[PDB]
Amino acid sequence: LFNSEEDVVKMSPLPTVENQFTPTTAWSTSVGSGIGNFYSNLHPALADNVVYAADRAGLVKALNADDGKEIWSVSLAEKDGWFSKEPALLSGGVTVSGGHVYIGSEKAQVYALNTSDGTVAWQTKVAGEALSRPVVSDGLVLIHTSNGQLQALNEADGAVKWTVNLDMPSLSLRGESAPTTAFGAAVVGGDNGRVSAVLMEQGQMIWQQRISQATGSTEIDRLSDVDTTPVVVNGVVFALAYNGNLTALDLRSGQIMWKRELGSVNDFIVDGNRIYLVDQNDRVMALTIDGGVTLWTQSDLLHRLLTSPVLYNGNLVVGDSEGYLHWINVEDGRFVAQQKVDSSGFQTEPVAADGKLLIQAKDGTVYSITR
């Protein structure tokens, strides 16, 4: 009847399976019901040979990072009190320093757990929900929110040191980026297509720079650029655009170092010399830090709804929405290897440390990978 008159703009076939080497799923665990029908950023974290997995129910799950063995764990969901039991809508990734592991939520709460035990150490009702990954700075925590506001919090007990409004458009895509803390400054990006830098105190600025090209009258062409956490090396910042353009920038001023063709991106990483980037067409490509000059570009994961990439074990790797992982060469853009791991949905970003590759798929399960 009508089923065939509806349409689905194509999501392209899977590329070359044949590989330089084969990876394997060294271990995996269930974490929750999780990202479910519900897209949000909740990648896990790793430190101290322990994986701080966390999942959207509100469950937090430390795992011994070599094993599908378990470490302290809690649910932060509302104690039901003869009312409607509400899941935390746990969100904004996972971050660890010192005595605490900090995790946002899609409601007012950011929860700090301890690293020593599963108890919530401090919780703070930040200004709108903590979609962004929290980041540490040796005594601060810095956060950004669905309402575009940035918050800075005091790492012992969660009191807000300062707030800043970064403005929002109608039809944002997230109202989310992590702050990045480099050369002593914060850099953050906001869905109006702006990136702003602050002096680590008082909420007072180093600059704003505005990345807002194409300027299409329709909001859907003009979701307004950055959500992706900007990053810095040598005080050279990088920022990038859902539509609009990637750019390298100064940090000391906000001056553009250079600007690049790269829209259709929500996800990237860098290294000591290069940019690696993924796309909403799910093209994947590499550039130099100077000038942002294209090192290589390839497109065989077209519309694969890929994750953010990471540099892992001397290759690139990326997650793929049918549950795959693709390993890609540093300099060639060829596929190095591929695997199927998830079977339920996978666009939440990879995490890599201690030579472990970790992902949390949708359907609330974590997989650990090695090659």
Binding site: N37, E86, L131, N147, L173, G175, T218
Partner: protein
Amino acid sequence: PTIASITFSGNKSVKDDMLKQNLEASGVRVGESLDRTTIADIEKGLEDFYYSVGKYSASVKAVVTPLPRNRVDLKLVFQEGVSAEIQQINIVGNHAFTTDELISHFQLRDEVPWWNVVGDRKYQKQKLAGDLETLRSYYLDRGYARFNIDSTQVSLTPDKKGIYVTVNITEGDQYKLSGVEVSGNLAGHSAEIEQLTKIEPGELYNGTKVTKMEDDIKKLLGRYGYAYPRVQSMPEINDADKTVKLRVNVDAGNRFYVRKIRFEGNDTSKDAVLRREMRQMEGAWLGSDLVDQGKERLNRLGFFETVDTDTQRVPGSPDQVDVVYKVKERNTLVPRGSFNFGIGYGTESGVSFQAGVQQDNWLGTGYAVGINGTKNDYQTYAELSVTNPYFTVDGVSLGGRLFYNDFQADDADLSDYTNKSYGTDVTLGFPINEYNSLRAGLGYVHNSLSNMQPQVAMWRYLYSMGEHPSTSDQDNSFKTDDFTFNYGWTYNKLDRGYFPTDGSRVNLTGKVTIPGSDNEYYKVTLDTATYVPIDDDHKWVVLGRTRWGYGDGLGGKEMPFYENFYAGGSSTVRGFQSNTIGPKAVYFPHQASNYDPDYDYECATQDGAKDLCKSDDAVGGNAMAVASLEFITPTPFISDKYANSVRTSFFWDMGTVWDTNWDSSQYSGYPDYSDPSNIRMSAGIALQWMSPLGPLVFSYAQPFKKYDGDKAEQFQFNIGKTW
């Protein structure tokens, strides 16, 4: 090139009408100028339009062809990923209520449940722009006077199909209504105004309550003719003590006078037949509720598919209004006005049919005429009625009718006779209250009968009159001549539209003869439908309808069989055959009289027994009770809900008809009709749709309970009733 054509491929789930409009809103039109460059502006604008309708993932492709004079056809082809689906709805800073409670009141939804696929979760900013106020009104009703929507936010997934909305809030706190103060140019109405305003100071302050208090103040001033008051509402807020001392401030304006009453529409209705349905008079002070009662009277008359009122201020002068009653006439001006034709076409092989007219567009001094003619069984039944519901302009009414009936009892449950009756009525209606009527009238009837089959339920009456025909025979004659008081009563209030949604209708109609007439039964009938809008808004409705009847002989002379209550008319209870329900007749034996051996005449001892013999004929019964409980629903189609307003309804029909004079001890061998204990139930769906004729109805119903007499057809088409 001129765009000598434009062609559209796909465009699923968006109406072509808004696309056709959006082309013009984008500066492209049929026969406009074009070039291959401009197509890039056209297609992105259509993407922008689809983006603007929530088709955020959409894409457009544009195809251009030269016609032989190099004129161009622009075909347009349309691509989608199923757009604006919503992952989440989220509310932040909230403490007072879990967000499921709030979103349950949104028109938006997060997860359309396995329990119900009705509705959807496609976001639309037009819906959100209302739903934020549904949130705000919920919180103000609960009473959080300092509630603010803080920088409300919408976020859409990096795959452009997904959406979720986050409404940050500060709830503040819920405040009690510790004071109300009302001041201004009240024209002395304070003694009523504050009696709207009465509250216990501990009651909860409430945005809905203050909204209705404002509307009620505008209603009171409407009543007394302050039609366009300024009405202002301001809380004094004690945040420290968390209470509202509410203030309402009113400047009544002038007392408006209705300079003209204007009816626009009415193209068949003489202006008189709308203007007599006014309560509020031109050339008098307005009463807003009086005008609304006029609107309700125009609805109750039913001649109008819509009735709308603009109390337009007069140009060039203050404090005068014209009340424009815009109307749209039902039946679209079709000739012969409201018109009747029917076929009772159902599962039965034979059928009954009907014809007629009634609308007051007729001759002379402008009396109405309405005529009806029918066949059922082998009957002929036909009547003239002549009517003036405003015999004078008080709305005292006249109606007289002259009617002829013949029955030839070839089955159709028609008990075996030849029966004729021809009759007149003259009636005067008094409206004795705004929602009421009374009726008083002469009646006459001449009833003459032949071929009379001896029939207990009939013949018990006949011999309690005397001059019965012979039993053991059928070539049998009887006659009666009658003069009567015909009398009745009504209460009517219906928020009618055309098919009512609210209010009650009750009609009571009865008679008694003049003394010593060839009958002296009294007869009473009552008829009712009460309508209620479910959720108190008129679109979703439940109905309860009842009929009741009695007749018993005054000084003997029980009610004649030829006027008993039939039921099982498809108007009265569906599924049962038009006359079938209640008592079934029992014949006395005869071998035959006036009989054809090639043809069937029941309980002839040459075809049947020689002892008191049932048939599935029904003579109705002398007493009746009927109910329908009925559940009203629309039905979308290419004739969609709004464009055609087709009504359909489930119903629990219930019926019982019986004979309070059944001698259950004497004619005892048979089902006891003295008691209603054979109640009947049928469960049914009926569908009503309207045409240059009138309202057609298709009905389905089969019994829930069915007794031996209960002849039935599981569907029947029918038309009219009109009242």
